[PDB]
Symmetry: C2
C-alpha cells in the first residue's frame, strides 16, 4: 500500500538549480509531493535530524554541508514510497550508484550527494515528524 | 536588475504532478527558486491574498487543493516570469509557454506571477518572511 517518506534536496542540488528535474524523477515515478518547503537548516537543526550519526567521523562534515546552504525538505507520498525513493536515489555513495539514479546523475562525491531519503518505515515516520507537522502535510 | 517575484503553482498543476516540469522551466530560463512552500490555502488566506479584487470563482479554485507558493529571483525576474507563463488565458498563450502547455482554461491556468514590481513586493511579503527567502 501507499506510504510517506522524507526526501531532502540537498544544498549542492539546490545550488545547481536542478530542483525541477529531480522533482520530476519523483513525480514521474508515481510519487507525489504532498508537503514541501525550502529552508536553511541550523547547526542545531542538522544535528538533531542526523543525531543517529552523532559519533561517526563524517558527522561534523555532514552537519557543515547540510547547513552550508538552503535545501528543499519535502514529503513524498505514493505506492511503496520508502523503497521507491531509495530506488530513484541510488547508493549513498555516487561512485556506486547505477547510471540514471539521482545520486549518479547529479552528484560526484558522497559529501555532496544531491538528495536524502528515509531508509525504513521507522526512520520515515521519525524524519517526517522532525521537519513537518501533520497539518502541514496535504495528502492528496 | 536582480528582482524577486511571487510564483504560485495552482491546484490544477499540482494535482497532475507536474511540479517538476514547471520548476525546471524557471531554472532553465535563468530564474531561481529562492523560497518555497506547499500548502493548502484557507478561505481568508486566498481572499487575503487576492486583495486588489468572478472573485468568488478565483478564490474557489485557488483553495480547491494544495498549491506551491514561492519566490523566483534573477535578472528581470518579474517580467521573465510573465513571458514564461504566457498569456493569462491558455486558449491564447503562445505555444511553449507554461500556460498553453499545462493549462486548460483561464480559470485553471497552472501558474501565477506577480504582475508588477509593486505587486511583487506586496505578494512576496504576504506569504513569506524575509528570513524564509535565502538568495544565491
Amino acid at each position: 500500500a501507499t506510504e510517506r517518506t522524507l526526501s531532502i534536496i540537498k544544498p549542492d542540488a539546490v545550488a545547481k538549480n536542478v530542483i525541477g528535474e529531480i522533482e520530476s524523477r519523483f513525480e514521474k515515478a508515481g510519487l507525489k509531493i504532498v508537503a514541501a518547503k525550502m529552508l536553511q537548516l541550523s547547526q542545531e537543526q542538522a544535528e538533531g535530524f542526523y543525531a543517529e550519526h552523532k559519533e561517526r567521523p563524517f558527522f561534523g562534515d555532514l552537519v557543515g554541508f547540510m547547513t552550508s546552504g538552503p535545501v528543499v525538505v519535502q514529503v513524498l507520498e505514493g505506492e511503496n514510497a520508502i523503497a521507491a525513493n531509495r530506488d530513484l536515489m541510488g547508493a549513498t555513495n555516487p561512485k556506486e550508484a547505477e547510471a540514471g539514479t539521482i545520486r549518479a546523475d547529479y552528484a560526484q562525491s558522497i559529501d555532496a550527494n544531491a538528495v536524502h531519503g528515509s531508509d525504513s518505515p521507522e526512520s520515515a515516520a521519525r524524519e517526517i515528524a522532525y521537519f513537518f507537522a501533520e497539518s502541514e502535510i496535504c495528502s492528496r
